């Protein structure tokens, strides 16, 4: 249930707009390789899987404080969001670091499995843990399912969490929880495969509406707005054959209005 | 039954949910969600697959609030559904064969099947076989008395999805000539290198009403959900392959309907 929603406030001061860029968290193996992950290991048996922290991309998130409008109670209601991945043309650099596609050719473009996801809500994004291999020892500095069992590889209802920390929740361990998130709208698409091509579209004319069937958007509890993202673009193949995840930042522009509640 | 007016008044609507586990074969206690490794090149005359190698349809029966003690039935109106755990395929460091020397592990890919159903009766199925001479193992329910026409259309191969982890996906499909009280949706994509493509959002809803505006009517206050979500093949370092499946979520909205 939550709160009982009343009328929408009108007036020139009844609308506000917030924007932000959300950095990607791919692992950052050293101070020069911001936006990349550590090179990927392979063929570790399920019984001895223990990835390094700098190899694991994580969800990005930020809490945006909104103007205090109570100064009947009011809440900021998120109505629309414009969002976009920043820096897609940087993958047209094929002269740096990447393995040549063949003798005398250019570098190999970033390609492979990718995941593009964003969420807007008045609460932190609620997440459900699912694991490829429950026996994985995840490293210090990450937050992954507690007390994992073999059912963590399908559905273990004890693996609930709030996306409440940045660069902490590995993407491979968590997904948005459809059984919750009453105060959040989320959108994501996964495409896996060695040769999956990145496909990214930019325009400042597209808007996603955040209202539900009753015309209510996410209501910002404690005057805070939550943005979340994960934009793994694919793998970068170095000249030696090693591979690293590559991520890019995401822009948000959210329009909000004042809404009466009881 | 003869369908009358929709009842109104707060207590007239209800909303139920459940997570439905995949039944991929589960070769041992640690590999829940996977199948046994796949055999190959067995001649049609001696095709004899093991049970743990065969993915099966998932199904469950969700009890609804009792209505009768002026007959009423629960009518499913909408469903929100989603495959759970799609980002776990971003683990390329465990168990999977390297794409090349010094590279990362090979992603899960290949043939996949994604299917769900919501109804007031058990999903009704029709059997079709790749090879009618296949000897299906103990523990599975497959077409009885298969013949060569089982490979195209044998109308005797009718079944209800009335048991979990027992009807192999490769043997059965939703029966379009029946299922008057069920809505089903499925998409098959086949091939070695087929990339998995999975979308998640809590903003999409499927309406279950038919042309007359009637949704599935729940017999005996029992709502049926069914699913099959084979995501592709996992390639181990040695080259062996296993199916990988994922669970599916349901949130169904229902209302009280008068019937005569």
């Amino acid at each position, epitope marked *: 249930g939550g709160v009982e929603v009343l009328e929408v406030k009108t007036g020139v001061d009844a609308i506000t707009e917030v924007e932000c860029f959300l950095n990607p968290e791919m692992g950052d193996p050293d101070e020069n390789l911001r936006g990349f992950s550590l090179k990927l290991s392979a063929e*570790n048996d399920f*019984s*001895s*899987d*223990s990835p390094e922290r700098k190899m694991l991309p994580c969800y990005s998130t930020a809490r945006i404080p909104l103007p205090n409008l109570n100064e009947n109670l009011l809440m900021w209601e998120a109505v629309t969001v414009q969002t976009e991945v920043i820096g897609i043309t940087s993958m047209l650099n094929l002269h740096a670091g990447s393995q040549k596609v063949h003798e005398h050719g250019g570098g190999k473009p970033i390609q492979g499995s990718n995941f593009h996801f964003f969420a807007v809500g008045g609460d932190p994004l609620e997440m459900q843990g699912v694991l490829m291999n429950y*026996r994985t*020892k*995840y490293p*210090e500095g990450t937050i*992954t*399912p*507690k*007390n*994992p*069992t*073999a*059912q963590s590889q399908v559905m273990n209802t*004890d693996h609930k969490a709030y996306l409440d920390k940045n660069n902490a929740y590995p993407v491979e361990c968590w997904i948005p929880d459809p059984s919750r998130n009453e105060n959040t709208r989320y959108f994501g698409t996964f495409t896996g495969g060695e040769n999956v091509p990145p496909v990214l579209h930019v325009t400042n004319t597209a808007t996603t509406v955040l209202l539900d069937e009753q015309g209510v958007g996410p209501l910002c509890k404690a005057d805070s707005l939550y943005v979340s993202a994960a934009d793994i673009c694919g793998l970068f193949t170095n000249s030696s054959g090693t591979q690293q995840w590559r991520g890019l930042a995401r822009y948000f522009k959210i329009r909000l209005r004042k809404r009466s509640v009881k | 039954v003869e369908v009358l007016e929709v009842k109104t008044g707060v207590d007239a609507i209800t909303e139920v949910e459940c997570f439905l586990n995949p039944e991929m074969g589960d070769p041992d*206690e*640690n590999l829940r969600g996977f199948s046994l490794k796949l055999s190959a090149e067995n001649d049609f005359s001696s095709d004899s697959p093991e049970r743990k190698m065969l993915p099966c349809y998932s199904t469950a029966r969700i009890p609804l609030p009792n209505l009768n003690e002026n007959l009423l039935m629960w009518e499913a109106v909408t469903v929100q559904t989603e495959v759970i755990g799609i980002t776990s395929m971003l683990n390329l460091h465990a168990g999977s064969q390297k794409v090349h020397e010094h590279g990362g592990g090979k992603p899960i890919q290949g043939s996949n099947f994604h299917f769900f159903a919501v109804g007031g009766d058990p999903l009704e199925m029709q059997g079709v076989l790749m090879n009618y001479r296949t000897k299906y193992p103990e523990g599975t329910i497959t077409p009885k008395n298969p013949t060569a026409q089982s490979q195209v259309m044998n109308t005797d191969h009718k079944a209800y999805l009335d048991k979990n982890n027992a009807y192999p996906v490769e043997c059965w499909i939703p029966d379009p000539s029946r299922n008057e009280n069920t809505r089903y949706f499925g998409t098959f994509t086949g091939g070695e290198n087929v990339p998995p493509v999975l979308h998640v959002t809590n903003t999409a809803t499927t309406v279950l009403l038919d042309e007359q505006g009637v949704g599935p009517l729940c017999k005996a206050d029992s709502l049926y959900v069914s699913a099959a979500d084979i995501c592709g093949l996992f390639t181990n370092s040695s080259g062996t392959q296993q199916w990988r499946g994922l669970a599916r979520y349901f949130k169904i909205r229902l209302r009280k309907r008068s019937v005569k």
Partner: single-chain antibody
Amino acid sequence: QVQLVESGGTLVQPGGSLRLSCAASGFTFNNYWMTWVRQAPGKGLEWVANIKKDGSEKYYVDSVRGRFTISRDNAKNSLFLQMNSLRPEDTAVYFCATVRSGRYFALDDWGQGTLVTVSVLTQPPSVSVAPGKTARITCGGDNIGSRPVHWYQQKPGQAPILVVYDDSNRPSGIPERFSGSNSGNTATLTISRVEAGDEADYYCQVWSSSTDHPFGGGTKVTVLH
């Protein structure tokens, strides 16, 4: 605050049955896994069985699977272990332990134990250290760095205490003098500014799978007094 009381231990004829009880108080019982650990007289600790918060998942060590049945009553804050077909190899003090710190089944709070009489990881047996000096206790195994390690301290005639969980993390109330590291094929516990109280038996535990919670034999650390 937290209190655990085991009961039910007595003499049992081989092939007989016995039912152990553990009364829990001082914490939210239904929020944590519970574990049974046994220790034969003069030997080390052995993981026997554990159970999920709501009891929907149960796991057993091989030697007792089929004979023992673990259960819990969250309305009464009680944990139970039903032992059938008891063999002489089952003779041990049985501990009741909570699963609070970390992700990989470390054991935080232990009871006083109850005695039942029926009738992989390499540790050095002994280590000596001077007071104020620094002592190292090692735990060895194949690719132990790939698995999580927990370290426990047990003073003679007392219940075990968890000093390090998930390789390097120290619980609240444990001094920074105790330190843990795990790499390669050896995990090491380091005790610095050694004090008289530090003298005890020290155990390493590894989580490899749901039924595999191996303990080490243990090392006696003796402070020159």
